[PDB]
Symmetry: C2
Subunit: 242 residues, 2 copies
């Protein structure tokens, strides 16, 4: 049947959290054979997220792992938690079909993207809107192959692409058990390149979204929520989760 | 018969526009019998929106109406254009059960809310998250009746509620052909209240979301897109729509 698409999503408690998960789930819920690995940045599963997944209507795995005392890129620990669960979930048996991609909880996805990453054999890539201080970022394709990168942040990277711009075959993840994300790098956005370097080469990259000429995913961060008028002493007569 | 839900969505061209329209559609696409009325704030229809609705995957009406200069309200013209259109199409029909609500293009909706507003007879209301400087605002309900409002702003309004917090039956809109939103409102924050006042009474309001104790809709806004790295001179050889 259709190979399973695993979505690794790190998340953390904040005012807009439930709203972001709600609309992301509204998109993922429509994807056939998708499994959502939602990883909370916390010492324990929160009731909010536990309740959400129970009512979300789509297969999921609820994980949690705290991010130590860390303008540095986060979610590194949560993403690795997803990788660990996956590599541990699949035994050295004989059935390892599937693909995975990394989806932050506030990123916007077009349903067209999944049919693209679904066929990933090694590592596929695609354009990402609103990132790197530019309208978009995308790998440059030549005769079906990646031969360059268009990005406003560190274009010298052997893999100058954003976390939201690629998918990795489950087999590739299982075959490279040592391949994880490492934030040790002083360079903020070097995690994706350092990771990808251990699994494939630019030549093996599978260009998606019409040879990388279409934006099917966008970075969308919501503005900080204004709570200036939130009551502290004369509270509402009921408790409401938001 | 199954009542049709009409979503009146005001929108305007900006870098995150397509992204926002993409995820709202991903939500609406899953609602049975829902007609999306997208109203552009422009002199004429835009190609991006026109092409988007063509492949959005759900029934819709593409309208457009300019808005004079106008910290002033917005979407007033677009929402009225939506009201006019509805009154026109159903200028005189028989079995035409329906309900409408106002959905900005950046708001988040839980699928559970539609089932609620579906049965609206006159006007229904519910809690709205992340609005008015608080975690939520909501109608106060006692014995199935709205007896007040929880909001830190102009609480003395006859209807101290947010635009995303109510739905009106199609019959109420038709029966009151002159009831529209007034931009001329010199007093700020009175749009919702002035509209509803000439349409229903507080005693007639139909409380939803478990007697207004659950938050199923949220205000969410994407931060301003950073383009500090957008190439001035040189550019990409290929045109990419974001």
């Amino acid at each position: 049947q259709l190979p399973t698409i695993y979505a690794i999503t790190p998340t953390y408690s904040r005012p807009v959290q439930k709203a972001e998960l709600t609309r992301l789930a509204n998109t993922f819920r429509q994807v056939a054979q998708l499994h959502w690995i939602l990883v909370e940045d916390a010492a324990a599963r929160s009731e909010l997220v536990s309740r959400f997944l129970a009512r979300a209507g789509l297969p999921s795995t609820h994980l949690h792992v705290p991010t130590p005392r860390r303008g540095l890129p986060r979610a590194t620990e949560q993403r690795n938690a997803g990788l660990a669960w996956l590599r541990q979930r699949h035994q050295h048996q004989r059935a390892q079909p599937g693909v995975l991609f990394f989806a932050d909880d506030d990123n916007t996805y077009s349903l067209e993207l999944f049919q693209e990453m679904r066929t990933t054999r090694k590592v596929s890539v695609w354009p990402v809107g609103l990132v790197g201080g530019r309208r978009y970022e995308r790998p440059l394709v030549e005769n079906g192959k990646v031969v360059g990168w268009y990005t406003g942040w560190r274009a010298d990277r052997p893999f100058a692409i954003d976390m939201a711009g690629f998918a990795v075959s489950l087999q590739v993840i299982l075959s490279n058990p040592k391949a994880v994300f490492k934030r040790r790098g002083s360079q903020p956005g070097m995690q994706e390149s350092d990771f990808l370097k251990q699994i494939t080469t630019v030549e093996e990259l599978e260009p998606k979204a019409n040879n990388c000429t279409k934006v099917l995913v966008w970075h969308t961060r919501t503005e900080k929520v204004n709570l200036a008028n939130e009551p502290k002493y004369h509270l509402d007569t009921v408790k409401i989760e938001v």
